[PDB]
């Protein structure tokens, strides 16, 4: 709605040992390209996820911070970083539309969550420091960095952030999806889709990427591409 007021509502913390549920590996599915960075199945519909966290009791204020054991101790930079849900939260309206991963000192999320619009946390207006529409992702704090590349050969692990629910640690075996251009690499699986912005971890308990470049294919078989840390601190490298 507001498309200028998106609150971070924490779903979980980034550490793959939730439920290790076996799945993955599905027939190479056809998918129709749209706006260069997006796809759908010919003419596909869309729905809000909806989320509850982020109370209206001083929901704007200025910045009360989401990382408080005691009342705000003048720290001004405390971050309960992890697997977040991106809800579009107007200061008088709450509607979840995607997800995002904040870890270390960088928040990497997705552009199609609304309009690549500004985030917020206790009314602190978290405005992007990077946004790439072509891959259709966003970075805050600099570029997308964390140092976490999924190694293609093994299973990809996804903290599938179930809508308004607990995460699901799923062992997904990789797959492909063919456009009019050609076949692309992803997790193509017939199963319930998570929120676009769920963390992609590798089976070693390391990696921290992002799931959401695709749609519900066939009639609900979620196909989305496997994104990983490609950028840097900002001007400085990944680490060295």
């Amino acid at each position: 709605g507001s498309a200028a007021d998106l609150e971070l509502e924490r779903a979980a913390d980034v550490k793959w040992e939730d439920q290790a549920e076996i799945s993955g590996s599905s027939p190479i599915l056809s998918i129709t390209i749209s706006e260069d960075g997006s796809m759908s199945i010919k003419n596909e519909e869309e729905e809000q996820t909806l989320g509850g966290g982020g109370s209206g009791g001083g929901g704007e204020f200025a910045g009360v911070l989401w990382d408080v054991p005691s009342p705000p101790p003048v720290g001004k930079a405390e971050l309960e970083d992890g697997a977040y849900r991106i809800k579009q939260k107007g200061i008088l309206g709450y509607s979840q539309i995607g997800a995002g991963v904040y870890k270390e000192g960088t928040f990497h999320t997705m552009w199609h969550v609304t309009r690549g619009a500004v985030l917020m946390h206790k009314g602190k207006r978290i405005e992007p420091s990077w946004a790439d529409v072509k891959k259709d992702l966003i970075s805050y704090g600099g570029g997308w960095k964390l140092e976490g590349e999924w190694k293609e050969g093994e299973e990809v692990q996804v903290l599938a952030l179930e809508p308004g629910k607990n995460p699901r640690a799923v062992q997904t075996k990789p797959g492909l999806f063919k456009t009019n251009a050609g076949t692309i690499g992803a997790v193509s699986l017939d199963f319930s889709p998570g929120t676009s912005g769920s963390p992609i971890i590798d089976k070693k308990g390391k990696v921290v990427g992002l799931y959401g470049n695709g749609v519900v294919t066939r009639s609900g078989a979620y196909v989305s591409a496997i994104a990983q840390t490609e950028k840097s601190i900002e001007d400085n490298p990944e680490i060295e």
């Binding site: 596909e44 519909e45 869309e46 729905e47 996820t49 539309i97 995607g98 997705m110 199609h112 969550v113 809508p163 889709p193 998570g194 929120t195 676009s196 959401g212 749609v215 519900v216 979620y222």
Partner: peptide, 4 residues
């Protein structure tokens, strides 16, 4: 439902 997309879900995206």
């Amino acid at each position: 439902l997309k879900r995206x």
